[PDB]
């Protein structure tokens, strides 16, 4: 649900789109995420790993 559940009723939203919201909040447009989604997933998985 992203950050919506911290502001009211929890609103479902796909996770691949949620990161596009969060990139949009640091000056990086959505185009970076979707066209590099596979790479970013591997980096995040390894970091958690």
């Amino acid at each position: 649900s992203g950050w919506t559940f911290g502001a009211g009723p929890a609103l479902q939203i796909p996770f691949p789109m949620q990161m596009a919201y969060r990139f949009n909040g640091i000056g990086v447009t959505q185009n970076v995420l979707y066209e590099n989604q596979k790479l970013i997933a591997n980096q995040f998985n390894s970091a958690i790993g």
Partner: protein, 66 residues
């Protein structure tokens, strides 16, 4: 996450692409207010195949009818 019209992806400038099952719409983050997907509220980037979740649609611009 996107719209492909002429072999090019299309991303929402400020909003998300929302469909009620038949027609697609772009609307604000926190208030449902659909608008027709034109070229001014969407910026093009990509090759229509790199993005996962592509859906075909029309993003027709106002410069063509006039």
């Amino acid at each position: 996450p996107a719209i492909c019209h002429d072999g090019k992806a299309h991303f929402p400038r400020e909003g998300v692409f929302v469909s009620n099952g038949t027609h697609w719409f772009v609307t604000q983050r926190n208030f449902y207010e659909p608008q027709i997907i034109t070229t001014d509220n969407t910026f093009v980037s990509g090759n229509c195949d790199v993005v996962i979740g592509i859906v075909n649609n029309t993003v027709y611009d106002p410069l063509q009818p006039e």
